């Protein structure tokens with residue numbers, strides 16, 4: 001695979017969003033990955049609806065949390081997901097108001113990356129586009145991350161608690177990284193982004209629960 | 216729906232198992248629901264493999280716990296689940312060893328019972344067959360149950376932690392119940408079974424995360 005990949009340069013990534021007070025990271029991560037595959041397959045970049053997933057993926061717990069795999073499975077079973085424009089983000093779980101008329105993307109399944117394999121995750125990002133990942137974002141250092149290749153000895157590879165999107169990889173000042181899009185608004189981190197350490201023993205559990213949707 | 220039903224009498228329930236020191240209750244629960252539908256579809260009762268689920272259902276956590284819907288989705292995506300004889304129970308998680316030659320049943324999706332709805336669980340047990348259900352099995356009273364209709368007010372319907380199989384319902388001396396098959400061996404409770412309070416405000420959360428497979 002190439003030495004560096006950055007899908008923001010290819011126009012596969014929408015602006016950084018802000019989940020606000022809802023534990024909907026899983027929904028933003030899932031929509032990011034679907035947006036990337038829709039740009040790859042059609043040429044068009046569009047914002048899809050995280051609210052649609054928050055209110056309608058009965059396997060997840062809405063603002064209480066959830067997994068990206070369950071979201072891809074709902075879009076597949078549902079035969080579609082709405083655009084953000086047809087089903088806006090409000091930040092609170094409400095009843096399911098899916099509108100078929102506004103469906104803007106579909107899902108034919110998902111693929112998972114081999115557990116804990118960052119070489120396999122690198123190949124996937126290069127071959128597919130953005131991939132949904134889970135990580136330990138619990139440490140205070142992550143929360144107050146600012147710039148640089150994030151790395152902290154404390155990170156627990158098996159306390160996965162947040163969902164984000166890997167949109168590329170590379171190296172900065174000698175340190176290999178993953179380019180991660182968060183859902184904490186543009187004021188967090190590096191304009192909403194964080195470079196997390198790569199090939200540093202699966203730092204933060206970045207390659208433990210990575211998946212992407214099929215289209 | 217009839218007043219009373221018991222699938223044990225119709226030949227739809229296999230013998231009681233023992234999960235051992237592995238938190239695979241979800242797998243036993245999932246396979247029990249699949250066994251019931253297989254019997255109804257083919258007229259044959261046989262043991263399906265919970266181990267195939269523990270080892271292969273990547274959405275769950277093996278012996279660490281899981282959900283039943285993930286299990287039915289795996290059998291759907293994989294085009295099959297193996298018999299017990301083709302994939303025996305070992306009680307520890309191991310790598311996937313699914314064998315297509317040993318396939319004993321298929322699944323075309325699942326249906327979830329609406330949350331907290333005992334009347335809907337009741338209808339499903341009557342017209343579909345055994346249903347997988349989740350409950351709070353954390354109290355000492357549940358652990359030590361021997362006979363009668365189990366009812367306890369400190370059972371927290373918001374603390375679901377164990378998965379079992381609703382194989383019927385009825386009434387015992389004016390107490391309506393649910394006939395439940397557990398995965399704690401043939402000595403726990405009443406030969407492996409517990410009668411749990413029915414129509415008593417969703418006791419133990421019996422109707423909070425119930426579902427069954429389509430075949």
Ligand SMILES: *C(=C)CNC(=O)[C@H](CC(C)C)N[C@@H](c1ccc(-c2ccc(S(C)(=O)=O)cc2)cc1)C(F)(F)F
Pocket residue numbers: 019022023024025026058059060061064065066067068133134135160161162163209282424
């Ligand atoms: C995002 C801001 C919050 N983090 C998560 O949602 C996180 C993401 C993972 C690690 C990719 N997942 C959390 C989580 C919380 C609740 C649930 C959940 C799923 C189903 C049900 S149910 C079947 O009873 O309706 C209840 C709760 C799953 C995942 C985490 F706790 F971190 F695991």
Ligand SMILES: *C(=C)CNC(=O)[C@H](CC(C)C)N[C@@H](c1ccc(-c2ccc(S(C)(=O)=O)cc2)cc1)C(F)(F)F
Pocket residue numbers: 067160209237238239240241273274275276279280281282283348349350375376377378424
């Ligand atoms: C049975 C003896 C143990 N109980 C359960 O498995 C229980 C059953 C429900 C209430 C029907 N579910 C537990 C559970 C524990 C862990 C997980 C889980 C799923 C996926 C992952 S992952 C995505 O990181 O691979 C981690 C953990 C699900 C369910 C319970 F905690 F009770 F919810």
Ligand SMILES: [Ca+2]
Pocket residue numbers: 059069070073274284285288
């Ligand atoms: Ca699922």
Ligand SMILES: [Cl-]
Pocket residue numbers: 199
């Ligand atoms: Cl590399």
Ligand SMILES: [Cl-]
Pocket residue numbers: 414
């Ligand atoms: Cl009744």
